[PDB]
């Protein structure tokens, strides 16, 4: 058989993103699950690269968010991609909990 | 043909995607900077630096 | 008489019909017109109007 | 009547040695895209006649 | 989760009464074509969800000639809704062709699982 | 270093990196039990264990 | 209607295939999407990697 | 071994063999199933079965003459085989009950008793012969809306509209003296045949068969005749091949001889030299596959037809096969060509040089109609001995690297993935 | 990953030489009882690792009567090792029952796959 099916790791990739049979009639509301997967990586990657400059004491909390926005190269990008991207997390997710509430995706067997 | 040179081998398809994104990187950056400064002539620092002529 | 499998759907079949056969059918139809009418069958009656007054060659529109 | 082999054939290696050199060029062209703006690599990257 | 024996107990009470049949059957007809499963080319008994084991049973007792057509009107609906279009007005399911063909295969599978649980809790009076 | 010697940019990034990597190890151990489960554990004789298995 | 009479795709089909021209156009618009997903992906991994370099204040005290 | 041609207004071909003990004599027409509209389709199949009808074969059996016939895409055929001492008794039959009188075969009794006997054979073909009703549905969707897509047997919906008018109107348009080849194979000299047409007359018609308005043009498509109540899954997949009298004719036959044919149940067809068989035997993805290179007058086909009980791993059969077609473009070895040279010279050494003369008369008339003369076997062996590895690579990159495909399937082809996951298997993305 | 065709080439050169057979065969059987696989009741061809298709092949061509004994000396060794004991001295495999019973089935199924790789890689002359 093919190597995408014969491997122990790639068959998890194969059975989920390559060969997974999706119904051929799903509209664009079925992309909000794939956006939340992308929007989670945006928060996590712009959390690690932002928490390398963040001190968490009560004296240096607000003074080291401004150290990100003024002193780090492209620091205004990271703080704004991640404070607004967190507010885009909850807007995609509110449209993801309302697709499933509309199209009956809560019912059995799900 | 054109297909037989560029799009046939994938080794030279992505060779001229990267060689077309290397030229696009330096050209589109210059052609945006040269527009964005020209849209704001009279307001940037090197216009104030020349207008301090004493 | 004239068979059904030669004048069945003479709308999509008049063009891309070979030209020797294309005027063979108008030769058989011109002998069925030397009869009292309303004895021609309807695939033979609506397919002589398409030959004389259809939309092909002449009477083709200026734009497709 | 025997070929050299180690589950890859020498006759099937010289059929890719054109396209293995074209893939080395398509990676060096991919290295130059991602590693410009590196000021150390711009000693041999604005030696080009424009840009 | 509404158990078609209970629908048809309510539903046959409406149609039997002369007053309520004059009243809310014309509301029911206007509700049907406003839903517009006919425009996708479906009957109603394609719409019923087939994941409970009662409805999973009644799709095996169906004859072959009706389970081949039902398995086609579903694929014409997954193809029509994919193009974001409707079916042409000749291909719409008319009023007379919308009959409950799968209703009697459900009411004999529902009453056969109601009797299985009325008999699994029987208390024999000595 | 984030600078010219081991300084405040370094220890601050050696903590946020050190917090992270045990959530890469804990997702590489799941990639380590998966490669084990397809063939099972070995046993100290080096012969097949498919005959006498216990749960 | 028999299964040998394929239905009309004439309002979807091209009027002239020329299979080295319809394929040198599909791989153009695919290649243009890969050309801006390389300028757009260098300029994303440059944002995160240069952010870990020396900050503006620690450059000032050199 | 030599074949000659003449012309008198009608071409006379003869492949004399002074060893065999029969003598086939027949006419081979230049029309087939590619010379009829989809509304009279099957009139070529209905003309064969009133030639082989009961009354016409009872008179032919009295002199010791057996009638054969063949209806193909490009050519028809009507052969009357007999002993070597009856090279004129079969011409006198073929002139009597095929050419001169047609009011005996086309009577109202013999036509209705034959229209119900083809309709029987077509209905028992459409539901009981699966590896060949796919190959009709491969031609009916590779070349759709074009003369090379019509089935040779005729559709069942068009075959019950034919009356004796459409049988005679096809005769006057295609059974002509400019369209025919009077062919004769077996134990007949050439000079006996041409003197036995001049001592008779044997004239058919005037000429000028109707010329087609649309040529054959490949269109990459698919068709899925899925049927879950069938125990297998038959699949035919093909690209556009080389037509006959192409310079790459024998390269396209050698390209399908590389991947050859396979039958999983034979113990000796499992030890072949194909490199495809190592990936196909580990989980037994198929039961059989044959690679074909069909070649018609205007176009052709090239691909493979298969059958499979392992209906869950179809998408690994199609993937592992198509990743071996890509080896033709990039890295085909010389031994894979030197093997398929020696098998192809045996493949078409058994086809043109078998014992049967009524098969050689089908392949002599179908060649001098198109080419004008039959290419001999000793010279067509020098065209296979001069094929290099570069000529297969130059052919494969033109004809099947990243080209469109035509798919036709039936049975349980749920497991068959859709088009763009098969069409994208033609190019390897690492070459 | 040593391929028994190879060690039967080095082995049968040692056995045929009269100098080396006097010298390193007394070291060989001293290596065997120091290894101590007989004390668990195992012949040596129980120990050969059975997870490659050249040796999984030669475990199907073994006769039924020897593939039932081999399936007993393995479980008798799994049971003896998990009690952390040894088999008693009247159950050890002696020096004569330690026969190469799986060597001819391996050597004929290893030289029939060397031949398969010398046939996918033939460069036939013109
Ligand atoms: C993470 C984000 C980083 C983005 C980096 C993008 C780099 C270039 C990718 C686009 C590209 O050039 O794709 C070309 C290949 C082939 O893609 P294809 O559409 O199958 O090409 C046709 C194959 N021929 C006929 C040419 C042989 O496609 C590929 O090799 C697919 C690579 C996809 C990477 C994700
Ligand atoms: C589901 C994932 C996450 C969500 C929804 C989220 C959300 C948020 C929000 C709403 C803020 C406040 C932004 C503001 O008001 O400025 C914030 C700040 C922050 N988060 Fe996250 N976060 C996520 C993941 C992470 C991760 C994985 C990290 C660290 C590795 C992280 C580290 C931080 C840091 C350091 C701040 C600093 C304060 C700032 O500059 O905004 N976050 N996050
Ligand atoms: C966080 C670190 C690790 C965890 C949680 C882990 C987990 C496990 C577990 C639960 C087993 C099954 C129990 C066993 O067979 O002993 C196992 C087996 C094994 N591990 Fe680890 N492991 C770790 C690190 C490693 C490392 C560093 C190596 C080698 C470089 C390794 C190699 C193996 C091997 C070869 C086996 C199979 C042994 C056998 O089944 O015979 N593991 N591992
Ligand atoms: C049902 O079919 C599917 C489907 O199967 C899947 C998978 C998805 C996609 C959904 C997902 C992929 C969601 C899953 C998300 C996660 C598992 C989140 C994991 C994300 C991470 C970023 C993991 C964390 C790892 C890191 C942060 C490593 C990066 C390293 C850093 C930042 C340190 C850098 C330091 C140096 C020195 C380089 C679908 O959208 C979908 O519907 C179409
Ligand atoms: C003695 C110690 C006691 C302590 C107890 C604490 C630990 C308890 C054990 C919890 C489970 C540990 C192992 C988890 C694991 O490895 O599974 C991850 C999925 C592996 O799936 P699979 O079984 O390999 O595939 C077998 C399949 O049938 C199931 O595969 P599927 O479920 O689809 O995989 C999901 C992966 C998703 O990945 C992606 C990319 O989406
Ligand atoms: C992980 C968190 C979820 C992220 C959601 C992203 C879901 C979509 C992923 C898109 C990957 C596209 C690869 C497809 C492919 O390779 O097909 C390849 C070729 O396709 C292409 O060439 C596409 C050009 C490259 C597109 C670059 C997109 C990068 C943008 C990244 C944005 C998301 C991080 C095979 O396609 P084929 O089988 O039809 O031949
Ligand atoms: C890793 C998650 C990142 C997701 C970012 C999505 C939100 C878009 C805002 C992007 C701002 C950061 C980029 C930037 O500042 O560059 C700016 C250019 O804008 C872009 O190129 C955006 C294109 C993004 C395409 C993404 C392709 C997929 C990449 C996958 C990761 C390898 C500035 O570029 P410059 O530093 O001047 O070279």
Curated annotation (Swiss-Prot), chain A:
Residues 52-74 are mitochondrial intermembrane. It comes from the Eukaryota. A ubiquinone binds at residue 16. Residues 1-27, 103-110 are mitochondrial matrix. The chain crosses the membrane at residues 28-51, 75-102. Heme b b562 binds at residue 82. It is found in: Mitochondrion inner membrane. Heme b b566 binds at residue 96. Heme 1 (or BL or b562) is low-potential and absorbs at about 562 nm, and heme 2 (or BH or b566) is high-potential and absorbs at about 566 nm. Component of the ubiquinol-cytochrome c oxidoreductase, a multisubunit transmembrane complex that is part of the mitochondrial electron transport chain which drives oxidative phosphorylation. Component of the ubiquinol-cytochrome c oxidoreductase (cytochrome b-c1 complex, complex III, CIII), a multisubunit enzyme composed of 10 subunits. The complex is composed of 3 respiratory subunits cytochrome b (COB), cytochrome c1 (CYT1) and Rieske protein (RIP1), 2 core protein subunits COR1 and QCR2, and 5 low-molecular weight protein subunits QCR6, QCR7, QCR8, QCR9 and QCR10. Belongs to the cytochrome b family. This is Cytochrome b. It comes from Saccharomyces cerevisiae (strain ATCC 204508 / S288c). The lineage of its organism: Eukaryota, Fungi, Dikarya, Ascomycota, Saccharomycotina.
Swiss-Prot record, chains E, I:
Its main location: mitochondrion. It is a peripheral membrane protein. Keywords: Electron transport, Membrane, Mitochondrion, Mitochondrion inner membrane, Respiratory chain, Transport. One of its GO terms (biological process) is mitochondrial respiratory chain complex III assembly. The keyword Secreted does not apply. GO terms for cellular component: matrix side of mitochondrial inner membrane; mitochondrial inner membrane; mitochondrion; respiratory chain complex III. The keyword Ligase does not apply. It is found in: Mitochondrion inner membrane. Component of the ubiquinol-cytochrome c oxidoreductase (cytochrome b-c1 complex, complex III, CIII), a multisubunit enzyme composed of 10 subunits. The complex is composed of 3 respiratory subunits cytochrome b (COB), cytochrome c1 (CYT1) and Rieske protein (RIP1), 2 core protein subunits COR1 and QCR2, and 5 low-molecular weight protein subunits QCR6, QCR7, QCR8, QCR9 and QCR10. Present with 10100 molecules/cell in log phase SD medium. Belongs to the UQCRB/QCR7 family. PANTHER family: CYTOCHROME B-C1 COMPLEX SUBUNIT 7, UBIQUINOL-CYTOCHROME C REDUCTASE COMPLEX 14 KD PROTEIN. This is Cytochrome b-c1 complex subunit 7, mitochondrial. The gene is QCR7.
UniProtKB/Swiss-Prot annotation, chain G:
It is found in: Mitochondrion inner membrane. Processed by both the mitochondrial processing peptidase (MPP) and the mitochondrial intermediate protease (MIP). Initially, MPP removes 22 amino acids from the newly imported precursor in the mitochondrial matrix. This proteolytic processing is then followed by a second proteolytic cleavage by MIP, which removes an octapeptide to generate mature-sized RIP1. Residues 60-62 are annotated as: Hinge. Coiled coil: none annotated. Residues 1-20 are mitochondrial matrix. Belongs to the Rieske iron-sulfur protein family. The Rieske protein is a high potential 2Fe-2S protein. This is Cytochrome b-c1 complex subunit Rieske, mitochondrial. The chain holds residues 31 to 92 of 215 of the full protein.
Swiss-Prot record, chain H:
Pfam families: Peptidase_M16, Peptidase_M16_C. SUPFAM superfamilies: LuxS/MPP-like metallohydrolase. Disulfide bonds: none annotated. GO terms for molecular function: metal ion binding; metalloendopeptidase activity. The keyword Transit peptide applies. Transmembrane segments: none annotated. The keyword Transport applies. It is found in: Mitochondrion inner membrane. Component of the ubiquinol-cytochrome c oxidoreductase (cytochrome b-c1 complex, complex III, CIII), a multisubunit enzyme composed of 10 subunits. The complex is composed of 3 respiratory subunits cytochrome b (COB), cytochrome c1 (CYT1) and Rieske protein (RIP1), 2 core protein subunits COR1 and QCR2, and 5 low-molecular weight protein subunits QCR6, QCR7, QCR8, QCR9 and QCR10. Belongs to the peptidase M16 family. UQCRC1/QCR1 subfamily. Component of the ubiquinol-cytochrome c oxidoreductase, a multisubunit transmembrane complex that is part of the mitochondrial electron transport chain which drives oxidative phosphorylation. This is Cytochrome b-c1 complex subunit 1, mitochondrial. The gene is COR1.
């Amino acid at each position: 058989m093919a190597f995408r099916k014969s491997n122990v790791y790639l068959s998890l990739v194969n059975s989920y993103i390559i060969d997974s049979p999706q119904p051929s009639s799903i509209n664009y509301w079925w992309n909000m699950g794939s956006l939340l997967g992308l929007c989670l990586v945006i928060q996590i990657v712009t959390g690690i690269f932002m928490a390398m400059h963040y001190s968490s004491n009560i004296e240096l909390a607000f003074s080291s968010v401004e150290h990100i926005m003024r002193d780090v190269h492209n620091g205004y990008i990271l703080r704004y991609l991640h404070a607004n991207g967190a507010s885009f997390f909850f807007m995609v997710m509110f449209m993801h909990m309302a697709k499933g509430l509309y199209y009956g995706s809560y019912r059995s067997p799900r | 043909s054109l297909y037989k040179t560029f799009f046939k081998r994938n080794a030279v398809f992505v060779g001229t995607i990267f060689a077309g994104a290397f030229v696009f990187q330096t050209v589109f950056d210059t052609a945006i900077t040269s527009w964005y400064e020209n849209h704001n002539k009279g307001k940037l620092w090197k216009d104030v630096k020349a207008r301090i002529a004493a | 008489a004239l068979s059904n499998a030669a004048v069945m759907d003479l709308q999509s079949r008049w063009e891309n019909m070979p030209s020797t056969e294309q005027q063979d059918i108008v030769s058989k139809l011109s002998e069925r017109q030397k009869l009292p009418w309303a004895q021609l069958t309807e695939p033979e009656k609506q397919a002589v109007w398409y030959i004389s007054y259809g939309e092909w060659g002449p009477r083709r529109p200026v734009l497709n | 009547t025997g070929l050299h082999f180690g589950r890859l054939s020498l006759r099937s290696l010289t059929a890719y040695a054109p396209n293995l050199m074209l893939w080395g060029g398509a990676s060096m062209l991919g290295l130059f895209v991602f590693t410009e703006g590196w000021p150390k690599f711009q000693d041999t990257l604005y030696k080009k006649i424009p840009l | 989760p509404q158990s078609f024996t209970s629908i048809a107990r309510i539903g046959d009470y409406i149609l039997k009464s002369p007053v309520l049949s004059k009243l809310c059957v014309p509301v029911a007809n206007q509700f049907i074509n406003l839903a517009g499963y006919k425009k996708l080319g479906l009957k109603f008994d394609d719409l019923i969800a087939e994941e409970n084991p009662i409805m999973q049973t009644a799709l095996r007792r169906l004859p072959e000639d009706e389970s081949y057509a039902r398995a086609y009107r579903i694929i014409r609906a997954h193809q029509t809704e994919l193009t974001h279009h409707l079916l042409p007005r000749n291909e719409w399911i008319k009023a007379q062709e919308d009959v409950p063909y799968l209703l009697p295969y459900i009411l004999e599978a529902e009453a056969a699982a109601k009797e299985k649980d009325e008999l699994d809790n029987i208390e024999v009076s000595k | 270093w984030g600078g010219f010697s081991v300084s405040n940019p370094t220890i601050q990034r050696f903590f946020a990196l050190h917090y992270l990597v045990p959530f890469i190890i804990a997702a590489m151990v799941i990639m380590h039990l998966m490669a084990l489960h397809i063939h099972g554990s070995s046993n100290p004789l080096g012969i097949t264990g498919n005959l006498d298995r216990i749960p | 209607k028999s299964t040998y009479r394929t239905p009309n795709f004439d309002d979807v089909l091209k009027e002239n295939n020329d299979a080295d021209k319809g394929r040198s156009y599909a791989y153009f618009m695919v290649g243009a999407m890969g050309l801006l997903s390389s300028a757009g992906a260098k300029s994303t991994v440059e944002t995160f990697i240069s952010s870990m370099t020396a900050t503006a204040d620690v450059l000032a005290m050199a | 071994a030599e074949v000659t041609q003449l012309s008198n207004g009608i071409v006379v071909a003869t492949e004399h063999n002074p060893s065999a003990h029969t003598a086939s004599v027949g006419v081979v027409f230049g029309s087939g199933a590619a010379n009829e509209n989809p509304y009279n389709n099957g009139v070529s199949n209905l003309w064969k079965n009133i030639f082989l009808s009961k009354e016409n074969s009872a008179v032919a059996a009295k002199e010791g003459l057996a009638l054969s016939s063949n209806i193909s895409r490009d050519f028809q055929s009507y052969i009357v085989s007999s002993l070597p001492g009856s090279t004129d008794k079969s011409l006198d039959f073929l002139n009597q009950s095929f050419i001169q009188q047609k009011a005996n075969l086309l009577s109202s009794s013999n036509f209705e008793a034959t229209k119900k006997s083809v309709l029987k054979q077509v209905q028992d073909f459409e539901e009981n012969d699966h590896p060949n009703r796919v190959l009709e549905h491969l031609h009916s969707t590779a070349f759709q809306n074009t003369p090379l897509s019509l089935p040779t047997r005729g559709t069942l919906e068009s075959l019950e509209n034919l009356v004796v008018a459409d049988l005679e109107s096809f005769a006057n348009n295609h059974f002509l003296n400019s369209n025919a080849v009077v062919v004769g194979t077996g134990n007949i000299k050439h000079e006996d045949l041409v003197n036995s047409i001049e001592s008779k007359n044997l004239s058919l018609q005037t000429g000028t068969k109707p010329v087609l308005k649309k040529k054959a043009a490949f269109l990459g498509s698919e068709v899925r005749l899925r049927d879950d109540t069938l125990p297998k899954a038959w699949i035919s997949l093909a690209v556009e091949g080389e037509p006959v009298n192409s310079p790459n004719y024998f390269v396209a036959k050698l390209a399908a001889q590389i991947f050859g044919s396979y039958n999983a149940f034979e113990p000796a067809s499992r030890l072949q030299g194909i490199k495809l068989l190592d990936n196909i035997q580990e989980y037994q993805l198929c039961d059989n596959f044959n690679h074909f290179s069909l070649s018609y007058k205007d176009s052709g086909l090239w691909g493979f037809s298969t059958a499979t009980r392992n209906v869950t791993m179809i998408d690994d059969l199609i993937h592992f096969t198509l990743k071996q077609w890509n080896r033709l473009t990039i890295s085909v070895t010389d031994t894979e060509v030197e093997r398929a040279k020696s098998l192809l010279k045996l493949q078409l050494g058994q086809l043109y040089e078998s014992g049967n003369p009524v098969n050689d008369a089908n392949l002599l008339g179908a060649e001098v109609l198109i080419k004008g003369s039959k290419l001999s076997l000793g010279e067509a062996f020098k065209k296979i001995d001069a094929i290099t590895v570069k000529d297969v690579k130059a052919w494969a990159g033109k004809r099947l690297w990243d080209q469109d495909i035509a798919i036709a399937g039936t049975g349980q082809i749920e497991g068959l993935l859709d088009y763009m996951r098969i069409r994208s298997d033609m190019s390897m993305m690492r070459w």
